[PDB]
Design a protein around this ligand. Structure first.
Ligand SMILES: C[C@@H]1CC[C@@]2(OC1)O[C@H]1C[C@H]3[C@@H]4CC=C5C[C@@H](OCC[C@H](CO)CO[C@@H]6O[C@H](CO)[C@@H](O[C@H]7O[C@H](CO)[C@@H](O)[C@H](O)[C@H]7O)[C@H](O)[C@H]6O)CC[C@]5(C)[C@H]4CC[C@]3(C)[C@H]1[C@@H]2C
Ligand SMILES: C[C@@H]1CC[C@@]2(OC1)O[C@H]1C[C@H]3[C@@H]4CC=C5C[C@@H](OCC[C@H](CO)CO[C@@H]6O[C@H](CO)[C@@H](O[C@H]7O[C@H](CO)[C@@H](O)[C@H](O)[C@H]7O)[C@H](O)[C@H]6O)CC[C@]5(C)[C@H]4CC[C@]3(C)[C@H]1[C@@H]2C
Ligand SMILES: C[C@@H]1CC[C@@]2(OC1)O[C@H]1C[C@H]3[C@@H]4CC=C5C[C@@H](O)CC[C@]5(C)[C@H]4CC[C@]3(C)[C@H]1[C@@H]2C
Ligand SMILES: C[C@@H]1CC[C@@]2(OC1)O[C@H]1C[C@H]3[C@@H]4CC=C5C[C@@H](O)CC[C@]5(C)[C@H]4CC[C@]3(C)[C@H]1[C@@H]2C
Ligand SMILES: *[C@@H]1O[C@H](CO)[C@@H](O)[C@H](O)[C@H]1NC(C)=O
Ligand SMILES: *[C@@H]1O[C@H](CO)[C@@H](O)[C@H](O)[C@H]1NC(C)=O
Lengths: 622, 309
């Protein structure tokens, strides 16, 4: 049976029409069919499956069947194995789909697409058994194992396989599909991380020492010295030195360190303006350093806008806005800039000058917190950031417990000790602020214990208490109860709750660390991709780069590269050969397993026993 | 026999030798400054630092101890987690301290006090030192304070803290205390626990490897501890001018006997490895399957022959 000639577009549509009518794919196709009928032979048309694929992948499945709207039914499919694998995957048939994957030309991309579809369908699954089967698709494992085989074979063709534009998946890079599938375990692979490191260092050698690198960075002229090695490949000499300068300063790592250094400078300038050069309203004028700070923040905003919006030429503005606001750190950035503009506006006035100063003071803290996000790419610190973001949950659990206990204790002691204090602010103080401070060793016995209460000049009149003329006289009716409650609260909080928090942190750290490393690698991919397109000049200078880019656009990628036809075909055949070798190795290792050897031995012993019994009967006859 | 530059590089390679060089440099600088009268206090301060350096060298001295050496290795490993926590705490502390200094003393020109209230106080909040007397308006004493910048700079009167929006300052203090004294400290504790569990076994091996070198080092060391050691040095120099249990050289017969004995032991060890591999469950299963296949085909042929007759 020749799949190339057997599988035509009409036959593929017939296969899609004859679904089991009891699985998810049939329900999705029915919903799409109803939508199409409401908008306006064969039960389901290629429009329905195209819309389902748009729900699942939304970028990869473009032009699979809409290009000719439907193609000729008598025309054979251009990518038969791709369509069969996709079809078998949409209906949770894993054995048939695995077989189709084993025969397809491009297997890493197919496996990543499969794992994406399975993790998308696991949410839509109705039966628990089907959902469990989908959650254990292990298609990402297929891609990881096959790429491990490919990387072990060549390690140079593997990078091209990673960054080539796949023909069967609408010119989508394998890394693009892995990003779409959120295959975190795939990005954690050694080969992908090695390629990302190669991109990270740019033209420089990946083994360049950090000390030598920063030493070269701080004194620019040492770039032309042989202090740092470079990967291979009068006017000519000028061209040579210019190329060396560009190759060093266009590297993502140098861009990142320039951004870090100038962000430190930005924070230092912000603090200086806030603490030493914050002048009266514009009637007396903001300081020159304040104007410089305003321009610096403006350039930071321009860079953020360009990064969020002008990197993708084709995408809905609302979709990009939703994607931008999806991130919590982008929410923090929006909060920072909103605080900056509010503080600037209030500072321009005179009746809201102090409010503007306070808002700017808060904004400094927000930016200093953004510094963590900035260092997220660091190899030693990133996993720690992930781990802390995980421990926040245990922090909240402890917060709930402590809050309940603190409400109880604080309200009880406030009632027992100051029952005649009308001031709401002081009620909240003595009820929540003081019990919170008892956690950190701040136990003011001077107003909880009668033997330690000083002979201050205190009153009991409510009118005098409210006016603040004299401090309220604390009630010492039953102060043994107050002291006992303080002892119990101190015991509970400072021992049970704190040690429980410590134990929860220990257990969570042990459970999380391994997944945190993988998540850091997956995040590092996106951050490096993000630094690839970033202009080489850190703000406030970045305005020069923005102006140059805008002027070039008005007048007129190492990753995700497109290869010639011959090289692409050679790489596809090489990947197919590696897949065949990997499957053969799996089959051989299964055949030499202890269990399979025992099964074969038992079967052959049974056959030998019956044959020997027959032979012995025949021999005994003669 | 070794290059002087090579020996110097090997010596400066060690961090503890760097500490020793720092100690002696501080000693000579302090002695020179103490000989003077205009730098007497500087020399005293440098010698005070040098005492701390020597007391720290005492750890290196006890490195050979069997109970303590692994602990020294483990601590040297935990330094990395200390630095991670230091980075996190430093970022958070810069943010909180600068924000509170801006919110609370916006009119204090003194740079020293700016750095104090921005970094020294927030650092001390970690260790239970929370001076609410100057962060909370209800707890600020009625001290005789001024707002004039000229008077503030001269130090005549303490600056009057700003209480414009002090609820924000108290809330920020509460959040900072929570974060630092709970999340960061317990995260450091958890990191230490995990690192201890991971490291202890390798730390023991590293201690043994270091112990070898330290014992070799004590083999050649003169038996007289300093300041007496000068007698040993003078005696050694005089003996050199006038004129090893480990690394011993053996007679030819004994050396040949030991080589043959080692070869015999190697042969026995390889034979034991081969025997243990041959008696393994997997190899037994493989041999059984192969012999069963051969027996099955042979029995099929024999059964066909018997059925013929
Ligand atoms: C292992 C575990 C640890 C926790 C705990 O269980 C065990 O320990 C238990 C111990 C217990 C406590 C044991 C003892 C007591 C004392 C008792 O008062 C007895 C009554 C007498 C009288 O009526 C009160 O006294 C007097 O009050 C006066 C106030 O008008 C003071 O006048 C002051 O007025 C002004 C104040 O500046 C100044 O002029 C002078 O300073 C001074 O003139 C006197 O000086 C003082 O003498 C109250 C209860 C208390 C605190 C116990 C509480 C519970 C414990 C902590 C247990 C734990 C579970
Ligand atoms: C479970 C969790 C724990 C943490 C937290 O969340 C929950 O707790 C919350 C509780 C909350 C706090 C609740 C209450 C308040 C009070 C509020 O002020 C109300 C406004 C009033 C008025 O405008 C200010 O008051 C008055 O100021 C004056 C200053 O001029 C004082 O004059 C003093 O002047 C001199 C000072 O020596 C001397 O002459 C005398 O000493 C005295 O005359 C008055 O005596 C005092 O009455 C500010 C906010 C604050 C502190 C909250 C902060 C946030 C919390 C800690 C929450 C946590 C997240
Ligand atoms: C962690 C929660 C946050 C929210 C909250 O409870 C803890 O904070 C508390 C702070 C309280 C303030 C503190 C001071 C004053 C000044 C006083 O003249 C009038 C009452 C008022 C505004 C109080 C109203 C009730 C408030 C917001 C409480 C509120 C439930
Ligand atoms: C952990 C880092 C170490 C380095 C550093 O920041 C923390 O230490 C801080 C101590 C500061 C000092 C403290 C006191 C004074 C006295 C004053 O009349 C003039 C300014 C000066 C010298 C300050 C200059 C800036 C200094 C070194 C800061 C410096 C960034
Ligand atoms: C307390 O205040 C009143 C106000 O008149 C005063 O008469 C009395 O002497 C004061 N006592 C002390 C010790 O402050
Ligand atoms: C504060 O200092 C000034 C200086 O003249 C003085 O007049 C005033 O009485 C002082 N007040 C207090 C309570 O120290």
């Amino acid at each position: 049976v020749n799949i190339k000639q057997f599988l035509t577009y009409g036959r593929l549509q017939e296969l899609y029409c004859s679904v089991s009518e009891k699985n998810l794919l049939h329900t999705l196709l029915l919903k799409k069919n109803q939508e199409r009928q409401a908008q306006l032979k064969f039960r389901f048309t290629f429009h329905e499956v195209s819309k389902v694929l748009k729900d699942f992948l939304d970028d990869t499945c473009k032009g699979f069947y809409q290009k000719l709207n439907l193609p000729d039914m008598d025309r054979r499919c251009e990518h038969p194995w791709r369509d069969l694998f996709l079809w078998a995957i949409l209906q949770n048939r894993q054995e048939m789909a695995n077989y189709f994957w084993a025969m397809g030309p491009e297997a890493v991309a197919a496996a990543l697409v499969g794992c994406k579809i399975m993790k998308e369908m696991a949410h839509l699954a109705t039966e628990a058994e089907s959902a469990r089967s989908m959650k254990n698709a292990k298609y990402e494992q297929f891609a990881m194992d096959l790429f491990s085989e490919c990387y072990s074979n060549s390690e140079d063709r593997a990078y091209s396989l990673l960054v080539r534009k796949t023909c069967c998946w609408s010119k989508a890079t394998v890394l693009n599909i892995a990003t779409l599938a959120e295959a975190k375990c795939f990005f954690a692979h050694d080969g992908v991380q090695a390629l990302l490191t190669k991109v990270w260092w740019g033209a420089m050698r990946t083994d360049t020492s950090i000390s030598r690198l920063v030493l070269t960075f701080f004194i620019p002229p040492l770039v032309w010295t042989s202090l740092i090695k470079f990967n291979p490949e009068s006017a000519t000499f000028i061209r040579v030195v210019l190329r060396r300068w560009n190759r060093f300063w266009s590297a993502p790592v140098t861009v990142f360190m320039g951004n870090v250094i100038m962000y430190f400078a930005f924070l230092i300038l912000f603090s200086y303006v806030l603490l030493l050069d914050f002048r009266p309203p514009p009637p007396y004028g903001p300081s020159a350093a304040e104007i410089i700070l305003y321009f610096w923040v403006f350039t930071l905003v321009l860079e953020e806008i360009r990064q969020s919006f002008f990197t993708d030429e084709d995408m809905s503005i609302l979709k990009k806005m939703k994607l931008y606001v999806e991130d919590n750190w982008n929410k923090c950035d929006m909060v920072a800039i909103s605080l900056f503009v509010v503080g600037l506006s209030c500072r321009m006035a005179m009746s809201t000058y102090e409010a503007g100063r306070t808002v700017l003071a808060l904004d400094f803290m927000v930016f200093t917190l953004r510094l963590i996000h900035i260092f997220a790419i660091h190899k030693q610190l990133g996993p720690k950031i992930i781990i802390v973001e995980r421990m926040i949950k245990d922090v909240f659990f402890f917060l709930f417990f402590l809050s309940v206990w603190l409400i109880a204790y604080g309200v009880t002691t406030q009632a027992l000790l100051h029952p005649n204090d009308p001031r709401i602010d002081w009620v909240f103080r003595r009820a929540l602020y003081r019990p919170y401070l008892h956690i950190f060793g701040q136990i003011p016995l001077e107003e909880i214990d009668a033997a330690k209460m000083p002979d201050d000049n205190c009153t009991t009149d409510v009118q005098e208490i409210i006016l603040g003329t004299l401090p309220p006289c604390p009630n010492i009716y039953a102060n043994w109860l107050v002291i006992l409650l303080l002892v119990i609260y101190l015991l509970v909080t400072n021992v049970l709750l704190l040690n429980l928090l410590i134990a929860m942190f220990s257990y969570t750290f042990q459970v999380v660390q391994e997944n945190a490393d993988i998540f850091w690698k997956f995040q590092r991919y996106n951050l490096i991709v993000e630094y690839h397109s970033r202009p080489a000049l850190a703000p406030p200078f970045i305005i020069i780069s923005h102006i140059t880019q805008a002027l070039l656009s008005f007048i007129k990628d190492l990753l995700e590269r497109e290869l010639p036809s011959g090289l692409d075909q050679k790489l596809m055949t090489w990947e197919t050969v590696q897949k065949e070798n990997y499957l053969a190795k799996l089959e051989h290792e299964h055949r030499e397993s202890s269990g399979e050897r025992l099964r074969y031995t038992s079967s052959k012993v049974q056959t030998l026993l019956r044959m020997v019994g027959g032979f012995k009967d025949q021999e005994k006859r003669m």
